[PDB]
Amino acid sequence: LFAGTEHRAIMVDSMLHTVRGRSLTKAQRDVIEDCLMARPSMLQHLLRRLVFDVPILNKMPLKLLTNHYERCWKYYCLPTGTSEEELHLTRKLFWGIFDSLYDQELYRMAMPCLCAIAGALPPNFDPRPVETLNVIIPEKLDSFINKFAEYTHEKWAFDKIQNNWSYGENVDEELKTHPMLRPYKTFSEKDKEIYRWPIKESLKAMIAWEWTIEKAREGEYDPREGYNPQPPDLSGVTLSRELQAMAEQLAENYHNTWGRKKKQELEAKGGGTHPLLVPYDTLTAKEKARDREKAQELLKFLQMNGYAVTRGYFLSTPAKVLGSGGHASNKEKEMIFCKLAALVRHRVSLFGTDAPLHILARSLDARTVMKSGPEIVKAFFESASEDIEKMVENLRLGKVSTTVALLPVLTTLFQHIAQHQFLDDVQVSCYRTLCSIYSLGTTVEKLRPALGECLARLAAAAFLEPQLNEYNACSTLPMLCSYLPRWWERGPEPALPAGAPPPCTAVTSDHLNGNILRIIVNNLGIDEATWMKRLAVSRARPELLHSHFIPTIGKRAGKVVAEEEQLRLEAKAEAEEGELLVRDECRDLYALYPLLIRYVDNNRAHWLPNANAEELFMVGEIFIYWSKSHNFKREENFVVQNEINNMSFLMAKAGDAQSGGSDQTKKKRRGDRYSTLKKMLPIGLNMCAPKTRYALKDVREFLQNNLHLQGKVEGSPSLRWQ
């Protein structure tokens, strides 16, 4: 996998060379397609070096390669939902891109998919070493530097004792002896500085960065010839992540102090370059370890001597707090360039809802603040519709998990009273407030009571939009006084008034949580009202959604009328079926009636009483044949084409299943053992491949019931085309 990482870093280097134009762009498309084609984790290690390259991305060509790599990080986002922290750094780079301000906005959309990757996380180089020699170390540390440099002698000697090295006047790598292997006390202080120099330069680097270094806590394989160190266990000292960062940045200092000199080391010579002359973030931890072990072990010995050591997923929630600051920055834009970047961030805001504890309420407060920056616009412009999409996401922000925000709802409710004098975009917020209420349906109160003042403005009064919001806003002795009057509204069975009153039935359905039987009668009355109203426009389709809620509110005796209505829909269909046959020597209106029957299937879902239907052995089987007769019209043809018209403005088998039981009660159990009349009924289905003539080949109790299964077999033939 490492070889793949090397080739990927090499192709990335080629893209950096591209950062011959169009051809190299084809090479960038090559690295893009290669990234898309792919272990995925090692690919994410090459994408980690490419994440350092992403840090280098923010140039437009590099932005494009970073965009395709971002799409690869979208495929990674799919695959994934350590390096995640680097992805957080990439999110910080995305915010930096927000600070950087056409195609770049699309690149920001790719950074929004990258933000989704951050949500999954929530689930030539130019070294610049700081000057060291100019800085002056306090001299109190010298007793420490003595012990740590002597320790350096202890380690450099102990490593030699691992190969049994010893003191010897002549240099020889093969003699297992070396002149330098003599006790540290024998060394002159100047010779001690040979060991102290990296140490003192390191501490000078710590002081140039003003990292704390102050006194505090207390601080203290066979034997071989020559000096015999048994070095203190510095490695067992445990650095914290802060101290790990400090050691990592001292290792970065060794990567820079030697890194700056290594450049000049090959500049004056006229020589080439060195592999370590690469950005530190690009480095693998192991290459970092060569200096890190020198860096950590220094901090571990500082901790061993007790010196204070400071620079002197959950972050994604903190990133939401940064978004709240951007929400405050949006408020600065609301006072009216920079707002357009916020408009670009609105797309990321849509992604933020797809991304999804008590701290999140502060983000919900920012979502409330977002409403404050949006409300001014309510009283290019499609961004407000995107904000309206964000307003749909604002419900998701409440679904994700102060008091002034509740007061703001009372203000928008007051705007409805202004509408009574006679705009619609402000009402769209009420649809979002309904979505906020639908989110609240899953789960101060006087502010909710302020909406009742709007409800008084709602009942007093294109208006279906505001009326639909009331259906969700409904989620009570006060309500009870008018609730009985709602039954009087059912006695009305003026078509326009039905659109608002239907929401009121849904309101009682929300209040249904015995007493429901009265509401069921209100629902059966709505069934008795819609049964006539649907025999006559598009407003009934809006009721069909409320009819689904009415189905949730749901009565077998009511079906006797619904069957007659379905038969009336069928008896009318017999003419509509004839309407096409009449033209043989239009039906588009029937598709609207089919939509009324689509609600009936939702009513059938309330009857799915289908469990009770097995115990019936009733007249439903004949009613199912009416739907089966409608199915014959569906595959005669033109009615199916008519449904496509209804589809432009935008099952039967469950009924068929009960029809199969006609072959039977106790006799149906015998049919299981027949592997009773269900077997003979199957023989009739063979005759359906080719009316009464088939029955004669076998009776009112049989030949009639067989006709249902035969017509169902014709519907099965209609299903055979699939």
């Binding site: 469990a611 097995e614 299943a657 199969g660 149906k668 053992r673 592997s675 269900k678």
Partner: protein, 384 residues
């Protein structure tokens, strides 16, 4: 009958297993600190706690006097909290300091979020404030129960020098009626802290129908009643499956999970509903139309476009404590699940085929020797 994998029931043999199986060992709380600025809150909370304790005694008819006898309702501690020396006072002081130390142990942010702020009795009827006015957060209540657990386990730790008292058991295992006292004092300390405005923020059985009975043709359907909700997982799976792997974690299995509804076919895939206990799973494998339809008491909800690699087998799997009634044919044993969506679709119960009860197999927890196959996670052997 010990551990078990089955037990008889009125509807039939319910499946069980593998069941689940100590001495108290409370965590130290004394080492935790409750520093000076909060020590004043320790004194105030100790005062209000001692007062509420005095009410708890006086409500029982306790009255102050030199005697400590219980039946006489006389007790020295009914005197003023200031009057009590830090021993007699420590009973409501040290318990409070340990309470806050345990709150620090819980990782609570119990700082000074807010400033601190009736029947006659015999020589001592102090009043504090209306502590119950503020609703507790449910997390704070669970933490209070943790306080009762830690304090009571510590009381057992102190009583360990004195086979064993019934009260000398871990808080998790003792009867809930015993809880209704330590939980009460925990509610007292909680209403005290919240009243002062202090925030507090903190081995799987598999059942397989017999391989001889494996389906490979036609449409099929079995059922699984469930006595108890939990980590159920019922579905169809290929015979050549290895039990050691968790069920549903591989391509060989096609099962619907109990809770959450996350049916599996190699990895997670959420769908359906978390059914309540007693609901029937009723799996419906379908060949030709290679799919596996699922239900919940006749309520249709799955896996689609599979293939018959060597047929399929009726498979179930239980959780550690979960229990359910696997069902396989017998029309008399058929109920709501088959009378509705069953015959109408023509799917067949197994006892339509069979007379003998269907034997199965299950994976014993017992390790046993088994020769190493050349294919495996490559623990390769090499004779030489």
């Amino acid at each position: 009958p010990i551990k078990e994998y089955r037990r008889e029931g009125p509807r039939g043999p319910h499946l069980v297993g593998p069941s689940r199986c100590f001495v108290p060992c409370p965590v130290d709380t004394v080492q935790i600190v409750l520093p000076p600025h909060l020590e004043r809150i320790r004194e105030k909370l100790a005062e209000n706690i001692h007062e509420l304790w005095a009410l708890t005694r006086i409500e029982q008819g306790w009255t102050y006097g030199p005697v400590r006898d219980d039946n006489k309702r006389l007790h020295p501690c009914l005197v003023n909290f200031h009057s009590l020396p830090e021993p007699e006072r420590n009973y409501n002081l040290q318990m409070s300091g340990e309470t806050l130390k345990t709150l620090l142990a819980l990782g609570c942010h119990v700082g000074m979020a807010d400033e601190k702020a009736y029947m006659m009795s015999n020589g001592y009827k102090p009043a504090p404030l209306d502590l119950s006015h503020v609703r507790l957060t449910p997390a704070q209540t669970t933490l209070v129960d943790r306080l009762a657990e830690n304090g009571h386990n510590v009381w057992a730790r102190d009583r360990v020098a004195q086979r064993r008292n019934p009260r000398l058991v871990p808080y998790r295992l003792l009867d809930e009626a015993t809880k209704r006292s330590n939980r009460d004092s925990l509610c007292q300390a909680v209403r005290t802290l919240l009243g002062y405005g202090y925030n507090i923020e903190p081995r799987v059985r598999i059942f397989r129908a017999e391989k001889s009975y494996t389906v490979q043709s036609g449409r099929w359907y079995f059922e699984f009643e469930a006595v108890t909700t939990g980590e159920m997982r019922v579905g169809w799976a290929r015979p050549e499956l290895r039990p050691d792997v968790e069920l549903g974690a591989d391509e060989l299995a096609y099962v619907f999970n109990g809770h959450r509804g996350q049916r599996w076919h190699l990895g997670s895939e959420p769908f359906g509903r978390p059914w309540q206990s007693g609901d029937v799973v009723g799996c419906m494998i379908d060949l030709t139309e290679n799919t596996i339809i699922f239900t919940l008491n006749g309520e249709v909800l799955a896996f689609r476009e599979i293939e018959i690699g060597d047929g399929f087998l009726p498979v179930c799997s239980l959780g550690p404590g979960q229990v359910g009634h696997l069902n396989l044919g017998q029309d008399v044993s058929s109920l709501r699940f088959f009378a509705i969506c069953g015959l109408q679709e023509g799917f067949e119960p197994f006892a339509i085929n069979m007379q003998r009860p269907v034997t199965t197999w299950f994976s014993k927890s017992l390790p046993q020797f088994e020769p190493v196959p050349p294919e495996h996670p490559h623990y390769e052997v090499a004779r030489m």
